[PDB]
């Protein structure tokens, strides 16, 4: 029952060649659904469930508000450069916004910004004031206290953003809840007296996966090295887990895959071989 919503903005000075300077991406439970770039200047749907449940009037309003923030983030790059006394080069203004509906029923809303990687400003819900991390972020709080932008942000993070997220889950009930079985491949490579056993999982949904190596039916978590969960072009995920072993012991090793699509943890061997062993 844990549902997440995130709208990530990026304002860049150096994109560089043939790339957009302003990029705004929207997410529902990790899955991409909203996209915006400074070149196209339009808010377009990425997945099928949003376009089927929303009209053009929705996307027309979604374009103008991000187009307005694009102009605000354009001047923000110049205001922040003068505070640090910088002529120009590579400077980035990042933004994080959205709500997290917990399994119990508690609402958690976030709204924060960062300059050149390091934290700049963050909004506090239990105080209704903007928190400044760096000494250069002090004039930002003075601007927020003058206009009173915190009041409009409070009603958004507590109601507007929450009400829409509840609908997004209902709209993509079939896509987000669907499980995808991964194609497992077990490999091995000999270098200098050591055999490097590799295990790859191809195309799986959702993102959480536990891929661990076994020796004689016993887990070797320390000896196994993982590359992390990497995403594919179609929306699916990939994972790479490697282990070092002595030559003539490769067949004694087994790859364990724990996924939502599988009822029990799938055990795969090199000579078996891999996912095609049924």
């Amino acid at each position: 029952e844990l549902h997440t919503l995130r709208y990530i903005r990026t304002a860049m000075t150096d994109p560089g060649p043939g790339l957009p300077w302003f990029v705004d991406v929207g997410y529902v439970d990790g899955e991409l659904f909203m996209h915006y770039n400074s070149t196209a200047r339009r808010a377009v749907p990425r997945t099928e469930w949003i376009a089927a449940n929303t009209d053009q009037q929705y996307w027309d309003r979604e374009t103008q508000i991000v187009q307005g923030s694009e102009q605000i983030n354009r001047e923000n790059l110049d205001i922040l450069r003068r505070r640090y006394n910088q002529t120009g080069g590579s400077h980035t203004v990042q933004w994080m916004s959205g709500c997290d509906i917990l399994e119990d029923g508690t609402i958690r809303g976030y709204h924060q910004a960062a300059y050149d990687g390091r934290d700049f400003v963050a909004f506090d819900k239990g105080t209704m004031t903007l928190t400044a991390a760096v000494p250069e972020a002090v004039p930002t709080k003075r601007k927020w206290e003058e206009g009173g932008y915190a009041e409009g942000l409070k009603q958004y993070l507590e109601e507007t953003c929450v009400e829409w997220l509840r609908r997004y889950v209902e709209y993509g009930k079939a896509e987000l809840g669907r499980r995808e079985r991964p194609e497992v491949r077990v490999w091995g490579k000999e270098a200098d007296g050591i055999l490097t056993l590799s295990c790859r999982a191809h195309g799986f949904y959702p993102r959480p996966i536990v891929v661990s190596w076994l020796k004689d039916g016993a887990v070797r978590g320390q000896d196994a090295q993982s590359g992390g969960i990497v995403p594919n072009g179609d929306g699916t995920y990939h994972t790479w887990v490697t282990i070092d072993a002595q030559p003539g012991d490769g067949d004694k090793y087994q790859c364990r895959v724990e996924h939502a699509s599988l009822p029990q943890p799938g055990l795969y061997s090199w000579r078996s071989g891999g996912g095609l062993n049924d």
Binding site: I72, N76, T140, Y149
Partner: peptide, 10 residues
């Protein structure tokens, strides 16, 4: 929905 342009002023 995306937040209003007003909440991005620095």
């Amino acid at each position: 929905t995306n937040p209003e342009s007003k909440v991005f002023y620095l």
